[PDB]
Design a protein around this nucleic acid. Structure first.
Ligand SMILES: [Mg+2]
Lengths: 137, 387, 59
RNA sequence: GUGAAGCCAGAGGAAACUCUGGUGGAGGCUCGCAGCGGUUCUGACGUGCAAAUCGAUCGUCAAAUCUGAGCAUGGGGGCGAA
RNA sequence: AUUAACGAGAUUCCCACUGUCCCUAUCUACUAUCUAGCGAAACCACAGCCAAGGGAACGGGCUUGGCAAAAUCAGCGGGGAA
RNA sequence: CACAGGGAUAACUGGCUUGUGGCGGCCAAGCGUUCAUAGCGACGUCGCUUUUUGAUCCUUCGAUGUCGGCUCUUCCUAUCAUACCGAAGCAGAAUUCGGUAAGCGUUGGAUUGUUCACCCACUAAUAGGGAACGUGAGCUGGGUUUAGACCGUCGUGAGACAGGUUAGUUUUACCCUACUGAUGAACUCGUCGCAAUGGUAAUUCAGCUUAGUACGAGAGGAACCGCUGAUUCAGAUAAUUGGUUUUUGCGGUUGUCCGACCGGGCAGUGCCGCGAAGCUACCAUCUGCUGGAUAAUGGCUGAACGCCUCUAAGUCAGAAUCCAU
């Protein structure tokens, strides 16, 4: 009984980036960009592309980086997006760019360090990303 | 052949006749179930919608992610000047339904109500209830006191006729509105005597409702003239290279049953339908004689709820008012109708007891920055027009 | 509750108004309204903007 | 816009010869207005302004380019870069 | 069989770009709309609400049932095997 | 390429038939460690349906627009998931066979004109079909199926090929009916009400605790109540965020014209920056109820048939079902 990866308790927020987006990669794993092919907790409705936001798991490949990681399919997590969104405290905010990291299906990071700020939602849901990150929000 | 990929239905068939409402004032179609062991009390009210604003409070919901932290919620302000009882009616039961058989009006009426029974009041003689008054002060109201006994004997439900004082609002209209309110008293004798006492005397909304309880809202929605299928029901648009129109539907029926059916989406009216919204929370019942009806227990400023420059397309509020969490159907200046709830609430979210901490009073006419003119002046400095 | 001061123009900010912008090098900026935000993103200088609080104090 | 022959000056080498800067203005060469043509929108109109038109976008543009008047070829015949 | 230059020739991939799309929203001009003036055409056995039955094997008219209230305006594209 | 004709005669729908195609039964030699029927079934035999393909030529040739895709509504059950249950070679978990049940769903992409198919990924699941092989005065025109042109095989030749390839005009609604909405004469003009009938709406998942527990030698490993959120759908609203700019509101600026400055015209809205009001977005915020009667099944009292038995008289509980609020 290996549970399907899906963050439990995640409140709704504006989904910034759909399938087909190229985000940056922020860790020392050797990849540079990430190409999304699916979203984990996705639903089902005719003609509607799946989408995700800061905090949830994604299935993605790499298209430029070390040749030992290419031509495969990895699970990833988003950590900061460039579209404004609001929390329950009523304040809107947004970063400069889209970025994500490569993880295990159980929830462990592949690399060892994060380069840049991180959204608060990613820290609460994934304990490993929080313990390894620097400045949050 | 069957449909290739399945998909849900566009629009709902429950609200089927999408036509303009028959009457401008909302219509309460059912009152809460009667209970003869409570004390006598009214079960509805009516007011006018002012506008919306923003508040901030602290949450009390054990087990949530935002427990005991500050949230930001939207609210709406309804302006509720007092009402004046005018009479009461009594209904009996029949094998074809309920029906009314008597009415008994008060001795003196106001120009506001008398203006409702006329369409051209200016060039009239205003003889509405002139001869009816002579029933009073004739044989000591014998005719009046017999109808009341009839209600006591035969009737089984009683309702009260009430009207608003529209002269106490910034509206340009002068014609008052009139409606009925049912009493859930405890006995027919009790609820007819209580009705008699309230003749030609105002009743305030704080005797009707009470704070942090759940109510129902009835009104008539906003109007749009005559819209196409894409906006009315919400269907997908056809490709960019379509001849003879693009913003449409492509197939409105199969060859047989050989007629266009009542379930296909077609162009027509949008808006101005009758609607009933339910489960709205009351945050605050503000009095009108108080000059600090927008302060809190932590923000000790002295101010009233009107923004800087009055609600847009509305005047100011100088009367009682209620604060409701969320949105309600209807545009500004439109007659709103409030009534008690039919459900039973045990959900730990409708039973929460709210205590506010801040109420926005900035201008909604733009990117308002300050709360009070005193605050603006002390920040702004001194200007060239201040001599 | 709390209040903040506009980074670019020094105007006061209550809860709910404006937005918060995080730059790449972990520096957080707040803008009271669209006018401040748009000017900042064009690399304009606050010192030369006549209506700013800093411009007034500088002169 | 590019810059073919012909002409002037200079420099390197034992010699044979080779380099550099100018002058000049060739080509069924090239970008692009008027004229000529008619690729796409399978756009507009489709009892039309019109029994073939209108709009944007396009092909060629100093030569196998465009065009007026006078004259010749007449039906199992003429003419045809077909 | 190869082939530099050329092509409004057919086909595949990459960078930049975008309402093609997720998923729709808004603005402007001219009609459509109402009025005064002028004022046609295609088409037409009689006409015009359905379900089942049988029949030239898919009826508006026949048989058995459902039902059924004057006069009208703007759209629509199921049917009249238009 | 032409003319006179043919539904006396083919290619498409419709009609009768069901061999072939699909689906379901009856007997029981045997498989299943032992044991015909937990789960299957040879040799034989009885049926059902018209989403495959055949056979016939009844209706249309003074014409019913002939592949596929896009959008939209509704219907069937031979049930993929969701509700409640009965069986097992059912310890738990994961599964397999059956019942009541069509209320509610059934996806995003690479290749091909494809219907058909095969891979990647998510999900509770990615079930099968009809409506003139639904749907061209609804769209498109990739293929077939006019005229131009190339190749291969055949023919002496004109030319042939259900062999390959490239370019090829898609017309009309104002009439009747049907549907969506909006007026309206008669019994004087109005205000406040009742409700026959018609419509109907919500859906699924996840996290915490129960629990490292019941069960099991171990490895493993549940469920009701409780709490908080989320996916699809429906009805509204504009305080905040975003979009829209003819507010031609304010400012900057190019060319030309008014002798210069100020103030202005023209460049169908000259161009750029900001931009209130209104409209608007799961790109933003709020909200979506409980009574009665039942089916499958499990029971109580109890004969027929001195015993037994949920049924024969009587009766209890009971589903996302049915009817109402
Ligand atoms: Mg253990």
């Amino acid at each position: 009984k290996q549970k399907r990866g899906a963050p439990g308790g995640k409140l709704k927020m504006t989904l910034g980036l759909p399938v087909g987006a190229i985000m940056n990669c922020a860790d020392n794993s050797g990849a540079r960009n990430l190409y999304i092919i699916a979203v984990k907790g996705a639903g089902a409705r005719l003609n509607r592309l799946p989408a995700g936001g800061v905090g949830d798991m994604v299935m993605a490949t790499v298209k430029k980086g070390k040749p030992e990681l290419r031509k495969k399919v990895h699970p990833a997590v988003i950590v900061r997006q460039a579209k404004p969104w609001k929390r329950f405290d009523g304040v809107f905010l947004y970063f400069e760019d889209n970025a994500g990291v490569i993880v295990n299906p159980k929830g462990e990071m592949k690399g060892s360090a994060i380069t840049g700020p991180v959204g608060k939602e990613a820290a609460e849901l994934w304990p490993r990303i929080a313990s390894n990150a620097g400045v949050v929000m | 052949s069957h449909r290739k990929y399945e998909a849900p239905r566009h629009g709902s068939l429950a609200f089927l006749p999408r036509k303009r409402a028959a009457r401008h004032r909302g219509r309460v179609k059912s009152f809460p179930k009667d209970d003869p062991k409570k004390p006598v009390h009214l079960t509805a009210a009516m007011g006018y919608k002012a506008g919306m604003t923003t508040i901030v409070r602290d949450l009390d919901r054990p087990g949530a992610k935002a427990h005991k932290k500050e949230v930001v919620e939207a609210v709406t302000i309804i302006d509720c000047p007092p009402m004046v009882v005018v009479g009461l009616v009594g209904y009996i039961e029949t094998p074809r339904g309920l029906r009314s058989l008597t009415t008994v009006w008060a001795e003196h009426l106001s120009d506001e109500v008398k203006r409702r029974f006329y369409k051209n009041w200016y060039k009239s003689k205003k003889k509405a209830f002139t001869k009816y008054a002579k029933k009073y002060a004739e044989n000591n109201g014998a005719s009046i006191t017999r109808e009341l006994e009839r209600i006591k004997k035969y009737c089984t439900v009683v309702r009260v006729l009430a009207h608003t004082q529209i002269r106490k609002t910034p509206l340009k209209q002068k014609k008052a509105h009139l409606m009925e309110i049912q009493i859930n008293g405890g006995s027919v004798a009790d609820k007819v005597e209580f009705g008699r006492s309230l003749f030609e005397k105002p009743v305030t909304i704080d005797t009707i409702f009470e704070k942090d309880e759940m109510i129902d809202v009835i009104a008539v929605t906003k109007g749009h003239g005559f819209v196409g299928v894409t906006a009315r029901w919400g269907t997908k648009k056809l490709p960019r290279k379509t001849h003879k129109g693009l913003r449409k539907v492509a197939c409105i029926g199969a060859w047989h049953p050989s007629h266009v059916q009542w379930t296909v989406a077609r162009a027509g009216q949008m808006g101005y339908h009758h609607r009933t919204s339910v489960n709205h929370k009351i945050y605050r019942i503000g009095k009108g004689d108080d000059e600090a009806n927008a302060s809190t227990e932590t923000d000790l400023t002295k101010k009233k709820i009107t923004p800087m420059g009055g609600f847009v397309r509305y005047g100011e509020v100088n009367n009682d008012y209620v604060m409701i969490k969320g949105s309600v159907p209807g545009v500004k200046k439109r007659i709103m109708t409030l009534r008690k709830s039919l459900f039973t609430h045990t959900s730990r979210k409708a039973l929460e007891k709210v205590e506010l901490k801040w109420i926005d009073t900035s201008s909604e006419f733009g990117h308002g920055a300050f709360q009070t003119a005193a605050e603006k002046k002390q920040f702004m400095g001194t200007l060239k027009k201040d001599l | 509750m709390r209040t903040y001061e506009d980074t670019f123009s020094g105007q006061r900010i209550y809860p709910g108004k404006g937005k918060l912008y995080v730059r790449g090098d972990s520096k957080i900026f707040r803008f009271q309204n669209g006018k401040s935000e748009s000017l900042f993103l064009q690399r304009k200088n606050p010192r030369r903007i006549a209506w700013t609080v800093l411009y007034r104090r500088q002169h």
